[PDB]
Amino acid sequence: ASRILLNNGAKMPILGLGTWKSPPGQVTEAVKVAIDVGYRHIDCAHVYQNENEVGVAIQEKLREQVVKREELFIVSKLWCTYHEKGLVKGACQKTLSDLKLDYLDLYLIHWPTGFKPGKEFFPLDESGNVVPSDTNILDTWAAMEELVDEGLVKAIGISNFNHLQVEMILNKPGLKYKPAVNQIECHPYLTQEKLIQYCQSKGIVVTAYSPLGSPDRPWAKPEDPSLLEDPRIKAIAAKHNKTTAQVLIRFPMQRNLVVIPKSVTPERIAENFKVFDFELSSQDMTTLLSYNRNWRVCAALSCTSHKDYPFHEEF
Numbered sequence: 001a002s003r004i005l006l007n008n009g010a011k012m013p014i015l016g017l018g019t020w021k022s023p024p025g026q027v028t029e030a031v032k033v034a035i036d037v038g039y040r041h042i043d044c045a046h047v048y049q050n051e052n053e054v055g056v057a058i059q060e061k062l063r064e065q066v067v068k069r070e071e072l073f074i075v076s077k078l079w080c081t082y083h084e085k086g087l088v089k090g091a092c093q094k095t096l097s098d099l100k101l102d103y104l105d106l107y108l109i110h111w112p113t114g115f116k117p118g119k120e121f122f123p124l125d126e127s128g129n130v131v132p133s134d135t136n137i138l139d140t141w142a143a144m145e146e147l148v149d150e151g152l153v154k155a156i157g158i159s160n161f162n163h164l165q166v167e168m169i170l171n172k173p174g175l176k177y178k179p180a181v182n183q184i185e186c187h188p189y190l191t192q193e194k195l196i197q198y199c200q201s202k203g204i205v206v207t208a209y210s211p212l213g214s215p216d217r218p219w220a221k222p223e224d225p226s227l228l229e230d231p232r233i234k235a236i237a238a239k240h241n242k243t244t245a246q247v248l249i250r251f252p253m254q255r256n257l258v259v260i261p262k263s264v265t266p267e268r269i270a271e272n273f274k275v276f277d278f279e280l281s282s283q284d285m286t287t288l289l290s291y292n293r294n295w296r297v298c299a300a301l302s303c304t305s306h307k308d309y310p311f312h313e314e315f
């Protein structure tokens with residue numbers, strides 16, 4: 001089954017295309033090839049600095065009538081420097097204009113931490129600590145709710161929120177809309193069993209990012225563990241006559257997660273989609289879960305003293 005029901009009553013494709021690090025001169029073609037071979041969900045963000053080029057591809061496939069807008073599920077995220085009440089609508093509208101959309105299907109608070117507003121995405125003090133904004137998760141959440149009530153977004157959600165931060169929103173005085181999704185890092189080295197059961201128990205769908213362990217992350221070190229080169233995972237792939245990436249994509253699908261592998265390589269974009277025709281066993285699933293080592297692609301050092309940094313807390 002290709003889609004999962006959200007608590008806003010809409011259906012979300014469980015496979016989407018990631019766009020973080022997709023070069024602006026390549027992502028248009030990447031998104032066009034992806035829609036041609038079946039993707040109907042694209043994961044975007046203003047901080048990725050490529051939403052205009054993503055939008056060009058979306059607009060072209062709509063114009064070509066390859067797909068209808070109702071058949072696409074387009075996600076974007078509010079960056080940290082825009083948590084302030086007065087900046088949220090403009091931020092969303094800039095994303096909308098760049099993506100050539102009149103609404104988003106899902107708009108996420110990208111990280112629970114607000115940063116000082118301005119031109120800089122990572123405003124720093126002279127010792128390299130991020131400069132916080134005094135804004136809190138709950139006021140930001142009300143501003144997201146306003147977007148729903150203005151018709152600019154169909155669903156709102158969060159990303160990189162821990163257990164206690166999710167609970168903070170679920171317990172918000174006057175909460176009007178629950179988060180639909182919590183998009184978090186998740187792969188066999190960061191299996192997230194506690195956070196996932198909590199969110200799922202509450203009707204919040206979980207999206208897994210960096211499902212392949214983000215081999216193109218700009219801060220990679222050779223001594224880091226490598227999912228795609230892990231012989232243990234490679235063995236499971238071989239047994240199923242699939243590639244290691246295919247196994248790494250099907251794994252979160254079977255945990256009732258949405259997953260958003262990034263590629264700009266047309267052959268891989270198609271390979272990554274061919275994951276609805278094979279099943280990992282229970283034993284495979286528990287074996288992959290056993291590889292957890294709480295290793296994170298995404299946890300910027302410059303942010304670890306922010307009041308709302310999410311990853312001190314166990315989950």
Ligand SMILES: NC(=O)c1ccc[n+]([C@@H]2O[C@H](COP(=O)([O-])OP(=O)(O)OC[C@H]3O[C@@H](n4cnc5c(N)ncnc54)[C@H](OP(=O)(O)O)[C@@H]3O)[C@@H](O)[C@H]2O)c1
Nearest residue numbers: 018019020209210211212213214216245261262263264265
């Ligand atoms: N919410 C957030 O904070 C957050 C954080 C991180 C990521 N995300 C989202 O999650 C998406 C996916 O995460 P990610 O970009 O970090 O990494 P990823 O999807 O885990 O890995 C992307 C890397 O894998 C390569 N790759 C793709 N398919 C492959 C295949 N079949 N075989 C071998 N290599 C393959 C890509 O190469 P090519 O592109 O050269 O093919 C690229 O180097 C992002 O792009 C973004 O949309 C969200």
Ligand SMILES: O=C(O)Cc1nn(Cc2nc3cc(C(F)(F)F)ccc3s2)c(=O)c2ccccc12
Nearest residue numbers: 020047048111112113298299300303306309310
């Ligand atoms: O953001 C993505 O989508 C990918 C992403 N991840 N990271 C690692 C990060 N670690 C963080 C930690 C916090 C924190 F909440 F923990 F304070 C807040 C914000 C971040 S960004 C980056 O540094 C980054 C830089 C440019 C574009 C995308 C990203």
